Amino acid sequence: GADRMSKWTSKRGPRTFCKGRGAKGTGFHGRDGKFVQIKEMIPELVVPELAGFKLKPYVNYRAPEGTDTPLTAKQLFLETAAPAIEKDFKAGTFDPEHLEKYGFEPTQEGKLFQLYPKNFPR
């Protein structure tokens, strides 16, 4: 009576049934039928030099925790744009039209990593 419950997998079907386990495709099928890898689709790990730096996977026990304040859009606005804005309004040089000097970005399509459609994995 077959098997209803057990999940459908490439191990189960005929020869013609090939269903990946969820790794991401690195390329396409070319002319000769041979497969071609696109160097751009293969994730490039960005790894910093760890050797010369001091931090460890664990922390000293007597070292204190702290009052837990989740970062909000507001606090981030106050640590960055608020000093510069107050500095240039106090000087009367504030321009409501172009805020780009403070770090505001009107549109996301120019830059490499966009925030809203979210161009980057991690």
Partner RNA sequence: ACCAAAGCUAGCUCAACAUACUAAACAAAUACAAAAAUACACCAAAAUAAAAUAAAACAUUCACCUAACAUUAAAGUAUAGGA
Partner RNA sequence: ACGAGCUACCCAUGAGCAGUUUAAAAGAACCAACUCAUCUAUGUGGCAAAAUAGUGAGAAGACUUGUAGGUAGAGGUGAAAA
Partner RNA sequence: CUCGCACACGCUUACAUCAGUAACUAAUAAUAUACUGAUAAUUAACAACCAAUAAACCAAAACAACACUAAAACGUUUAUUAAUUACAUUGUUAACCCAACACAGGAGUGCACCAAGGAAAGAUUAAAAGAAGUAAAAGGAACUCGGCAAACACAAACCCCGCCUGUUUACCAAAAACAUCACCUCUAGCAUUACUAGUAUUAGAGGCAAUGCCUGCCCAGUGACACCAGUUUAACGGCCGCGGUAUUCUGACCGUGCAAAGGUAGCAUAAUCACUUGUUCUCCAAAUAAGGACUUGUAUGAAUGGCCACACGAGGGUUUUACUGUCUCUU
Partner RNA sequence: AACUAUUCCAAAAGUUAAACAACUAACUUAACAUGGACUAGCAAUUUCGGUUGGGGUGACC
Pull the structure tokens for residue 95.
């321009």
Q: Strand, coil or helix: what is 27?
A: strand
Applying CB under 8 A, the span of 35-43, 47-55, 56-64, 88-96 interacting with other proteins comes to: 88-96
The nearest distance, CB 121 to Mg ion, in angstroms, is 24
Pull the structure tokens for residue 8.
């459908």
Conformational region of residue 117, where left means phi above 0, alpha means psi within -120 to 50, and beta covers everything else: alpha
Task: For residues 85 and 102, give the distance between their C-alpha atoms in angstroms, rounded to a whole number.
Answer: 7
In the complex with RNA, which residue's Cβ is closer, 1 or 52? 1
Q: Which residue has the tokens 């079907």?
A: 13
Task: For residues 109 and 107, give the distance between their C-alpha atoms in angstroms, rounded to a whole number.
Answer: 6
Instruction: Compose the 17-46 pattern: x for residues touching RNA by CB under 7 A, - for all others.
Output: xxxxxxxxxxxxxxxxxxxxxxxxxx----
The nearest distance, CB 44 to RNA, in angstroms, is 10
CA atoms within 13 A on the CB side of 28: 4
The nearest distance, CB 100 to RNA, in angstroms, is 30
In the list RNA, other proteins, Mg ion, none, the entry touching 38 (Cβ below 5 to 8 angstroms by class) is RNA
In the complex with other proteins, which residue's Cβ is closer, 32 or 44? 32
In the complex with RNA, which residue's Cβ is closer, 3 or 49? 3
Residues that bind RNA (CB under 7 A): 1-3, 6-42
